[PDB]
C-alpha cells in the first residue's frame, strides 16, 4: 500500500465528519505526497517535531491548532455554538448574544499569537505537519450524542444526570480514562431534562453559553472542560446541571475513530501526547 | 565505582530525608530503571529537556515539578498538608478545611483537564528513565527554613521583627546566593514578627484564603515561596499581618540541594540545569 | 566577510535605537567572538536551542527575555512608560501613579520565574545565545511614530483613527502581516486627537496607562497587544481610542531593520519563530 498524502489524511477526516472542507481551526503547515508512518499527538509544538525526527517519522498529525491559519482563524469556528444552541431551541438572538464575550476575546488572542512559531520549526526540519481539530471533535460529538440518546430516550422524564454519565461510561475512552467525569454544577441525582452535548464548537462555551441553555429549556449542558472560575459562577447560580467529561478522554473519542481509519489505509500511527 | 541507583532507591532517599512513610501523590516514577549512574536533574522538565538529556547521554532524568501521569492527576491530594500545617499553628481543623476548599475545588478541576500522558509519552518513546520528586524535597526545605528562623528569632521574643526572619533565611546559601530577593508584599520589614508559619511543602502556596486563616488565628507573619500577584494585592489591601515571599527557585533549592548531595554521596553524578 | 561577536551584535542594536546603555530586558546568556550564521526568532526556549544545534547555527538571537538578568530585571524598563507619558503631556505624578500596579505585579512575576532554565540549556549545549528586546522595540516605536505623524500632521483636527491605521499599513510589516490592526476601544471613524504610540516600554501599559493618557489630553493610545480583560475594562469606560497593532507584526518593525544590518555585515540570519 502506497503512503498517503496530507490531502488524503485531511479527506479521511472530512469524510467521517461529513464536512465538505477543512474548518478554520485546522491546517496543513507542511505538505507531503507519501506518509507511511506518522506520529500523532493532541499537543504538538517544536519539541514534539524534534521528537518525530529522532524517531524517523514521515510526518506529524496534531489535534490542537499549532499556529498558522489554524491559530489565526480559530475564532471563525465559534459560530458552531450558535448552531448547537438553536438546534436545542435557544432563540438565535439569545444564542448569538451568549457567544459575543468568547468571540471578542478569541479575536484578540488570535491577533496576539506567534502564528508562525511551530510551522517555522516544521519547515526548517522539513517535517510534514498538519492539525485536524473541529472534524474529529464533530465525530466525537455525534458518538457522544448517539450514546446518551439511546440510553436516556427510553427513560423519558425519569432520566437523571447519572444516566447520561452511565451512557458515556460505556465508551472505552471514558471507561479507561485516568480522569473522571465530573458534575461541577447540579448533581448526579438531578433530573436530566433536555441535554446539550457542547463539543465540536472549537472550545467549551464557558459560563454564558451554559447560562443561555439553562434559561431556554436545556437543563443539562455537557462540556469537555470548563475554566474553574466559570464552573464556580454557574454552580453558585444553579438552574441546571453541568457535566464536564475530561479534555483528553473526550478528544480521544473522535481521534480514535480517525487513527483506526488511517491504520486501515495502511498508515502506521505512533501514539503520544494523550493517544 | 559503586553500582547505579534504581528509581525505587532515588524515591527512598528523598522519603527518608523528608521523614515520610508513603510516596506523596505529587511525585511519581514515569519510566523505571534499576541502574542510574549519571542523571540530569531540573526543577521543570518537559519533552525538550528529555531530548536534551538523551543528547547529553544521561541515564535518567529527575524533575521536581509534577510532569504529568499520576503526579499531575493526583496533585490535589497533597493540599490536605495545608490543613495539618494550619492545625499545628492553632487553626481549628474545620476553619482550616474551610480555608482550602476553594483551592481544592479549582485544583481538582485543573487536574482533570491536563494532558497527563504528554511528557510521560515522550520519556517512554525515548526509553528515558524519568521521575519527579516534589513534596518530599519541599518538606526537607520547610523544616530547614523553620529551624533557621526559630533558632534566630526565638531568643528575641516580642522584639523579633519581620527583618530578623529574613536575616535568618539569608544565612542559608540558597538565599544568600539567590539572584532573586526575599520580598514582603504585605506588612513591612519593621513590623513585629509575632508567630510565623512557614507555608512550604503543602504542594503550592495557600494564596489569600490560607494566609487570612493564619492571620485570624494569631499568626502575624505568613511565609510563602510564591504568591499570585492578585492574591498579594487582596491581602495587602486588607492588612493585619505580614507576608514574606522567599522566591520560588531559591526556596525549592533548599530541599533539592540536600537531595543532590545525598545522591552524589551514593556515587550518582547529577547534571544540574532548569534552576539547579 | 568575518564573524561577529555577541558584544558587536548588541552594539549594532543599541546604535540603531540611539541608546548608550544596555536595557535590563536584554542580556547575553552565552558569549562568543565569531558568529557568521545565527538563528533568530521572537520566542526562543530549550526546544528552539536544540533546533539551532540540529541546523548547525553558530548562535541564537531571541527577541523576548529568555531568563537570566533579562527576566529578573525586566521590571526596570517599565520606567520608560513614565517617560513616554510625560513626553505626551501627562503630569509626572499621574504618570508615576498610572504604572504602579503593573510595576508591583511585574516585580512579583520577576521574582517567581525559573530564570536559569533556558540559559542552563544554552550552556549545556555550548550554544552562544542572547536576547535583544527594548532596543529593537524602540527602533520600531520611532518608525511607527514618524510614519503616523507624517500622514496625520497635514490633517490636524480632521485626522481620524483610520488615518493613523492607513499610515501603518504603508509599512511592509503591517501590509504583509497575517493579522489585522484592531481598534478594541473607540473606532476607525473617530477623531484621532493626540496619539501616543506606546511601544518600546517593555510591555503594553494595559488599562491603567491607557486611562492616564485618555484623562490627560491623549485621545488615542496605541499598543501592539493588550490583555483581553484590560481591553474590555477600557471599552466599558470609553475615554478615547485604542489601536492594537498586533504583537508579531509590530515586533518585526524593529527586528527587520536589525536583521538587515546583520546581513550588511555578512552574518547569515536563519529566520524562524515569526521572522
Ligand atoms: Cl474546551
Ligand atoms: Cl507556590
Ligand atoms: Cl505587549
Amino acid at each position: 500500500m502506497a503512503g498517503l498524502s496530507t490531502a488524503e489524511l485531511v479527506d479521511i477526516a472530512l469524510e467521517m465528519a461529513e464536512m465538505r472542507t477543512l474548518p478554520a481551526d485546522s491546517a496543513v503547515y507542511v505538505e507531503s505526497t507519501d506518509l507511511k508512518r506518522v506520529m500523532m499527538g493532541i499537543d504538538i509544538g517544536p519539541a514534539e517535531l524534534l521528537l518525530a525526527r529522532q524517531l524517523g517519522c514521515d510526518g506529524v498529525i496534531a489535534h490542537h491548532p499549532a499556529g498558522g491559519s489554524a491559530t489565526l482563524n480559530f475564532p471563525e469556528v465559534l459560530t458552531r455554538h450558535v448552531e448547537l444552541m438553536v438546534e436545542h431551541g435557544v432563540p438565535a438572538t439569545a444564542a448569538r448574544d451568549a457567544i459575543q464575550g468568547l468571540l471578542t476575546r478569541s479575536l484578540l488572542r488570535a491577533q496576539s499569537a506567534n502564528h508562525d512559531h511551530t510551522p517555522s520549526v516544521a519547515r526548517l526540519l522539513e517535517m510534514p505537519f498538519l492539525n485536524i481539530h473541529l472534524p474529529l471533535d464533530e465525530v466525537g460529538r455525534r458518538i457522544m450524542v448517539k450514546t446518551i440518546q439511546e440510553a436516556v430516550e427510553p427513560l423519558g422524564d425519569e432520566a437523571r444526570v447519572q444516566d447520561a454519565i452511565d451512557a458515556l461510561m460505556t465508551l472505552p475512552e471514558f471507561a479507561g480514562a485516568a480522569t473522571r467525569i465530573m458534575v461541577p454544577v447540579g448533581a448526579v441525582d438531578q433530573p436530566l431534562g433536555k441535554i446539550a452535548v457542547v463539543h465540536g464548537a472549537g472550545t467549551n462555551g464557558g459560563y454564558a453559553v451554559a447560562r443561555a441553555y439553562f434559561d431556554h429549556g436545556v437543563r443539562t449542558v455537557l462540556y469537555i472542560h470548563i475554566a474553574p472560575e466559570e464552573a464556580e459562577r454557574l454552580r453558585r447560580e444553579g438552574g441546571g446541571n453541568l457535566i464536564v467529561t475530561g479534555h483528553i478522554a473526550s478528544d480521544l473519542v473522535g481521534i480514535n475513530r480517525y487513527v483506526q481509519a488511517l491504520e486501515e489505509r495502511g498508515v502506521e500511527v505512533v501514539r503520544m501526547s494523550g493517544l
Side-chain angles (χ1 to χ4, degrees), chain A:
Chain A
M1 258 178 301
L4 271 65
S5 76
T6 45
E8 284 172 308
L9 305 176
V10 161
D11 288 335
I12 291 172
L14 297 176
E15 195 193 68
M16 60 176 68
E18 310 191 330
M19 284 174 174
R20 75 170 311 153
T21 198
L22 194 57
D25 63 5
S26 311
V28 179
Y29 314 102
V30 182
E31 294 176 339
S32 182
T33 61
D34 178 354
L35 305 182
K36 275 262 79 182
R37 185 175 160 262
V38 300
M39 198 192 66
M40 187 171 183
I42 288 165
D43 299 305
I44 307 298
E48 294 72 28
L49 292 172
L50 291 153
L51 173 66
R53 174 51 42 78
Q54 204 152 298
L55 295 172
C57 295
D58 290 345
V60 168
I61 311 179
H63 173 249
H64 197 262
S69 70
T71 298
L72 177 72
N73 298 324
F74 174 84
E76 287 184 17
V77 312
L78 296 168
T79 184
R80 175 58 158 150
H81 279 287
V82 174
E83 307 182 356
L84 293 177
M85 278 184 272
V86 165
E87 212 148 88
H88 283 86
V90 182
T93 62
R96 281 185 310 253
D97 293 331
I99 60 138
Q100 292 308 308
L102 174 53
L103 180 57
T104 298
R105 298 187 290 268
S106 295
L107 287 151
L108 279 166
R109 286 197 284 268
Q111 188 221 37
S112 302
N114 181 358
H115 313 88
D116 205 38
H117 181 172
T118 307
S120 69
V121 176
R123 289 194 313 271
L124 281 173
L125 284 173
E126 295 190 288
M127 179 63 74
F129 187 42
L130 62 304
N131 85 296
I132 316 159
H133 194 248
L134 221 68
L136 300 190
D137 295 345
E138 180 42 30
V139 168
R141 190 192 60 83
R142 196 153 320 154
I143 287 163
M144 279 171 76
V145 165
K146 196 173 108 171
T147 300
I148 295 158
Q149 281 320 310
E150 296 184 352
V152 306
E153 274 162 349
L155 271 33
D157 303 291
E158 239 56 54
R160 286 186 309 147
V161 163
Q162 184 59 63
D163 298 309
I165 298 167
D166 288 349
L168 292 151
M169 287 300 279
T170 67
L171 296 170
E173 291 77 10
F174 298 110
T179 52
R180 71 178 193 91
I181 299 176
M182 294 167 75
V183 184
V185 183
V188 274
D189 66 353
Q190 295 295 104
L192 183 75
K194 278 174 50 56
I195 176 165
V197 177
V198 187
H199 173 53
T203 186
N204 72 82
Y207 167 83
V209 169
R211 182 79 271 152
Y213 279 113
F214 296 166
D215 289 1
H216 291 97
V218 175
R219 196 189 175 134
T220 304
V221 172
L222 184 156
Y223 290 163
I224 73 166
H225 165 66
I226 198 179
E229 299 187 354
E230 291 197 275
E232 183 53 34
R233 188 183 182 188
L234 284 162
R235 184 210 71 66
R236 73 175 158 271
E237 294 175 3
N241 317 292
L242 189 70
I243 297 163
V244 179
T245 50
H247 171 39
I248 299 316
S250 299
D251 285 348
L252 287 185
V253 179
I255 293 177
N256 286 322
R257 290 297 173 92
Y258 188 58
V259 171
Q260 176 68 36
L262 289 199
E263 286 161 351
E264 287 166 15
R265 292 281 296 271
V267 166
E268 174 185 346
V269 176
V270 174
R271 292 177 165 258
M272 44 71 71
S273 183
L275 274 76

